[model samples]
Target: LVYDAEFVGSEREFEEERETFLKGVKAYDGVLATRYLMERSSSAKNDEELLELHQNFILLTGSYACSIDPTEDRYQNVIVRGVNFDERVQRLSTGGSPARYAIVYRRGWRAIAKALDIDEEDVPAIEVRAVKRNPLQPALYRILVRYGRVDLMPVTVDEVPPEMAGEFERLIERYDVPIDEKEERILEILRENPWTPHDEIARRLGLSVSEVEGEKDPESSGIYSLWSRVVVNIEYDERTAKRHVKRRDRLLEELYEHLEELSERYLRHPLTRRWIVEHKRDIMRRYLEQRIVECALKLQDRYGIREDVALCLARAFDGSISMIATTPYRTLKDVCPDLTLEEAKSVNRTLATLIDEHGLSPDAADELIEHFESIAGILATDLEEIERMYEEGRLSEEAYRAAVEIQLAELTKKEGVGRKTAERLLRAFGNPERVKQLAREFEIEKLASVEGVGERVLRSLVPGYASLISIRGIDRERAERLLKKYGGYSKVREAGVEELREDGLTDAQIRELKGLK
Candidate 1:
């Protein structure tokens, strides 16, 4: 039977690349997933052969290694991938890293081995296992290393030299890295640069991406790029930009020329011929004019630029009244110049004030103030309390004080806006609003990092700080209650939605939490 063998777009290119760098994966079988024996027969395949096959598989895909599941009675061969995303390849992501997952064959073979008095070290040739835990994108893999008693074996070839053990230790360290951070970081990279090369990102960021069919790691090292990339088409075209203008023009034309209103509302004044040009054109005038100032204010909080200048930037964006405080050629430093001139007049004279208050230099003040500011405004009080908590002889007082102070500062920054902004943000768009639309677009996870800030703060702040003006549904009492109950802003974060709900939260509160996102 003849089958069409014509090369298809991307498929041929991928296959060519796959075969060139990863033919060794076939040794583990073309099946990129777990070796759970979709087809297995008595063919007298020994442990030594299986070990060699496993090594070849590693070389080809570089994602996972093989280990025997001792519970299946010992020497049987089961090759499962340990690394879903090997850090070697520059193409595949964890999504594509066929092995980006830590493939675990079912029934806790390791546990069974422990129960049977077989130590992890003593046991030989067990398929490597990976346990996946991502609720948002769920994944599970289990491979039976040894089917039954027919698989156990005693072999000297399974043991390795002591020198190569360091590589194994490194692998163990990589595996031990916090999965939440790992998952979050991966999401961040993808979220920020959707088309960033998976392999390239893995290389720069120290990830593994061995997810291809017949994919394998060469140094028995995991690769990050082999992970899957959710494909999205991104096109930059002048036409797309032009369409926006065209639509705007059409909308303006309709507003001017069309007679009937949807709700049949009456106009305040008598219509005239000249009103068409002036009215519609005025409507189109600088809706985005406000965006620049809003963005500047947000950048100011994150960057701690002088309030005078930040306000100036805010004013600049808004195209507000003239008579600028600072010139375009000057930096924030130029205006403040060590707070000699600017601090006396600045509204949020943070950079200079911190220097004077803490006897800090500009750089030191910036770091301390920036960290504190990152927490919105919660850190100042919290850090002061922490100092009181761990006063004099409690611990390394100086280090503890500095650390606590920094932490407190971060919490304060998080509450920089309020509940009103949080709710308004969601209604305007969605969970992650457009950078321009968000008042504090530049602030990266201000609340996510602070220990005390919760979804409640987000519910409040997102709305009040977004492009829109109002968010009515938020619980002002609960949000304030949460902040007060948590005591330290950092503490509030630990108090999640469940605890808040259990504390007799309202339906409106729950919905606000859902929208706070």
Candidate 2:
């Protein structure tokens, strides 16, 4: 039972609310149907069984408002095309599937067409939206089918009508007065001076204004064309249109009720829906269908924030780990452009010696962090080479990395330089365990946090390159060479970013001596 008694026309709204009801039943019913159905009966015992009773009402009124019978096969092709027909039959039987809409969006459209007698393609896109908006509620679905997007008008939903005309046919008959010279004189005064007295108009016209004004004839030709009176007609047609619209709404209500009645009448016979319910497993899967639309539009809005971070985080963070880790840089600007856009370009060119790279997901921070944890897990723990895992796998990787990073960082916290922690941090996070989970749990906020942490570390932890130190951090001459020659801290130690951890003429010197073949 609706909490507030009113009519709602949109099939989408109906379906959403219907699902809400079924969800209430499901949650309150302990996720079991038998108890739910029984409890449902207590609410309806006064009437016949639920389904057949509703079906009776639906059949009686639906017969008046809509040309289509939902249960019939004449329109099945339209209804079945996009719907999860297999699932709808069950939730519908129990009234447990409000997610199921009576929409044959495709068929519903076709039904409107057949009602309006237009070809499917010949129908204008506006017409489609007009009908979807329920014409009474046309602004919404009109925009949906019209623009391929949403644009809600500021007016309240209830204020909008199917059309401004209250009754197109009625106004033509009721208010029309035969237009004669005398009546014309009166209306002219009525137009220019609504406050003018009928007696005064009579005085001016030398005809009784009451006699002129009271004239009633369908064919009356008043001086003023029908256009000015259209507002009155529109208001009339509008009210009439809504009366029909509200009537249609009630029919749907009736059909919904009639459906229950029919189900009760026939549900026990074991030939129609009962047998289907008893044995139909595929029928059960249909509850996943959304009655209206998926809310992906809300998600698209975050691109501004995510896209900006993608462009900003490249420079201070090492490109190598992402390079080795296969993270995507969204664009050239998204590359590590710390010193200058020009220096960033030159750095990319110098890194050509290591082989030019395309990065991983443009959003990859906690990704690397989580990857680090997974690497540590597989390297330091028991989770194996798990390439086949799916999206939910990020949490495991995230926990594993946070646990291992703290562990590995504990090792550096003792050693005190912390560069070793970053390197070790790389080894664990870079292993790319549960890569699917990384994408699933991917967040721009976490990636931005990683960029923030990495930058803080870069600002404090000086890269030790013998030549790099000599050139100063801003030296364009050797910045590219230092990046290429010593992409990691161990290699940086070889080039003299820091004292070599285990000194023996390191790889940086070896690369310098060999000249990077």
lDDT of each: 0.29, 0.29
Model 1: how far residue 369 lies from native, Å: 20
Score candidate 1 by TM-score against the native.
0.20
lDDT (tens digit, per residue) of candidate 2 on 1-517 = 0001122235654454343233222221111122123334455434334423322222222212222221222222222222232222221111111111222122233232332234443321111211211212221222122111111111122333322222222332354412234444555665554434333454577542223332011111121122122222323233443354344444334433434343463245322333433533322222111111111111123112232323343221211112212221223333433323222222222122112232322233223322321122222221222221223464344333344443344234432336454444334334222111121122212322332234333323323322333422334234334444445334543454233323334455545533453
Q: After superposition, how far is residue 508 of candidate 1 from its true place, in Å?
A: 19
Candidate 1 weakest lDDT stretch, 10 residues: 146-155
TM-score to native of every candidate shown: 0.20, 0.16
Q: Looking at model 2, which ten-residue stretch has the lowest summed lDDT?
A: 124-133
Residue by residue across 129-156, what tens digits does model 1's lDDT show? 2111111111111111111111111111
